[PDB]
């Protein structure tokens, strides 16, 4: 019964078009609870879950301030990075950052994270020991020394191991009904005959939460999933998820094929026979 | 709760 809290930040330069775009989103498992968007009206950190609303003036004032600090640091970084790589002022660039923490079944600290990317790939990441940095290139080395001198990992470690887990637990309790919930998938199959000699079986998992799930096609031991089509687990729109897998089984062997559903809301892994 | 000490790159 593990959990995790994560924050995602996105920065995009707008060449010839003013200030860059800044989006910040916070999540507790698969459930988002806050957001900040530079294009939005309020210009403050906002709630996206019902349980975060009864937090108070001091919470929203502080979160707003802190989100503006991150936007400022990012806004400045876009210029810095273009400097390091000597890029033109003509092109648009992206910076993304993520950090959070995972707690075990007992809600005690497990893992801590802090990654940073530029133009879609890793630039610099804190190591699992929360005391070291991994640089992606010579330019990222500049940042690494700069951060070592600035004592940043020291600061993150304190946060990711403490505050982060302290607050997560706070949210877990406050969102007791929503977050600590677990929904088993409403599974079923479907068969689409292409012709007299070509059949398609589709395993269907629907209405499950969290999104963690693994679907496997197996013919009494046969590793068919190696040749199975699986779609990215998608959101239904009401807090639950959906996913499916399908294989082209030549008419006849279809009844020997069975699907395997894996989800935390199911005691024993379901095996559906056709 | 957000982190309180971001630093430029």
């Amino acid at each position, epitope marked *: 019964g593990s959990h995790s809290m994560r924050y995602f930040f996105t920065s995009v330069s707008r060449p010839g078009r003013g200030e860059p775009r800044f989006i910040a989103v916070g999540y507790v498992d698969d459930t988002q609870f806050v957001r900040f968007d530079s294009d939005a009206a309020s210009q403050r950190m906002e709630p996206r879950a019902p349980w975060i609303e009864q937090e108070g003036p001091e919470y929203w004032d502080g979160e707003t301030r*802190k989100v503006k600090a991150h936007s*400022q640091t990012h806004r400045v970084d876009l210029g810095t990075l273009r400097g390091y790589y000597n890029q033109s002022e003509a092109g648009s660039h992206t910076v993304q950052r993520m950090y959070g923490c995972d707690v075990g079944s007992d809600w005690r600290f497990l893992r801590g994270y802090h990654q940073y990317a530029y133009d879609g790939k890793d630039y610099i990441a804190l190591k699992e020991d929360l005391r070291s940095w991994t640089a992606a290139d010579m330019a990222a080395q500049t940042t690494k020394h700069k951060w070592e001198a*600035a004592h940043v990992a020291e*600061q993150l470690r304190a*946060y990711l*191991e*403490g505050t982060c887990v*302290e607050w997560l637990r706070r949210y877990l309790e406050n969102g007791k009904e929503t977050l600590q919930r677990t929904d088993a998938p409403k599974t079923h199959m479907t068969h689409h005959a292409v012709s007299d000699h070509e059949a398609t079986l589709r395993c269907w998992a629907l209405s499950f939460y969290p999104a963690e799930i693994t679907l496997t096609w197996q013919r009494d031991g046969e590793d068919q999933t190696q040749d199975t089509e699986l779609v990215e687990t998608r959101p239904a729109g009401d807090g639950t998820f959906q996913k499916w897998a399908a294989v082209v089984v030549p008419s006849g062997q279809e009844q020997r094929y069975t699907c395997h559903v894996q989800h935390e809301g199911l005691p024993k892994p379901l095996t559906l026979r056709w | 709760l*957000l982190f309180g000490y971001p630093v*430029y790159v």
Partner: T-cell receptor, first 114, second 110 residues
Framework: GVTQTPKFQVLKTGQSMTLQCAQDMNHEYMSWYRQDPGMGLRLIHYSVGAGITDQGEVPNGYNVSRSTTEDFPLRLLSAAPSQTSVYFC??????????????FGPGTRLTVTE | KEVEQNSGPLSVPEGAIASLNCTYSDRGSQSFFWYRQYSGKSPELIMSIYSNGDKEDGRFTAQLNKASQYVSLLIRDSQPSDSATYLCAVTTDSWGKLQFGAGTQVVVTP
């Protein structure tokens, strides 16, 4: 560290005066406080970066600027007897560093008479 | 946000323990400090705690109880030079405002 001048100053109501303050730690966040026996320290003004300036708890009667990141001068335009107090200047790193510690300056003692 | 500090003058004999308490209101506070101010001088930093626990470096010992929103400072082996007024400060972020307590006066009699 943080240096500030003058150390002492006598002025009469109406005289203007500027309390200079400087830091060489490459800090982006500097502030001004006044310390009175009955209230302790009270923020007057503060600045998180160059060109960015905001009023604190008791900004009335004080002026402030920040063209550079190294200095943060507090300017009284027309002295008042209530402005008699001890002025401490202080600084934190801001977005330029992960160390939360704020450092105070030596202090300046000022007195005003009508 | 506000910080409430110990009390008035705390007198202790040379060699004894001087223990100070501190309490804050903003639950989201992330950084905590202790300053020592000698009469007619500027506040000097002596302790910083970023995790809740016991930081005992030097002759000073600092405790942080986030759940109870409480901070401490125990001065072991008291010297009369310790006579100063101690200020408790707390903050949320790098752009947050530092907030001090009214200050608690310690007098180590010889």
């Amino acid at each position: 560290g943080v240096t500030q001048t003058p150390k002492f100053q006598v002025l009469k109501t109406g005289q203007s005066m500027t309390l200079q303050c400087a830091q060489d730690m490459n800090h982006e966040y500097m502030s001004w406080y006044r310390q009175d026996p009955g209230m302790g320290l009270r923020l007057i003004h503060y600045s998180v970066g160059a060109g960015i300036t905001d009023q604190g708890e008791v900004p009335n009667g004080y002026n402030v600027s920040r063209s550079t990141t190294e200095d943060f001068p507090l300017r009284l335009l027309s002295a008042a007897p209530s402005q008699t107090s001890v002025y401490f200047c202080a600084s934190r790193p801001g977005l330029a560093g992960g160390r939360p510690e704020q450092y105070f300056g030596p202090g300046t003692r000022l007195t005003v008479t009508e | 946000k506000e910080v409430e500090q110990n009390s008035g003058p705390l007198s202790v004999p040379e060699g004894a323990i001087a223990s100070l308490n501190c309490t804050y209101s903003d639950r989201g506070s992330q950084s905590f400090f202790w300053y020592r101010q000698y009469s007619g001088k500027s506040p000097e930093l002596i302790m910083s705690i970023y995790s809740n626990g016991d930081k005992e470096d030097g002759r000073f010992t600092a405790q942080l109880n986030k759940a109870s929103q409480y901070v401490s400072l125990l001065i072991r082996d008291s010297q009369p030079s310790d006579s100063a007024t101690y200020l408790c400060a707390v903050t949320t972020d790098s752009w947050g405002k530092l907030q001090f307590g009214a200050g608690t006066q310690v007098v180590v009699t010889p």
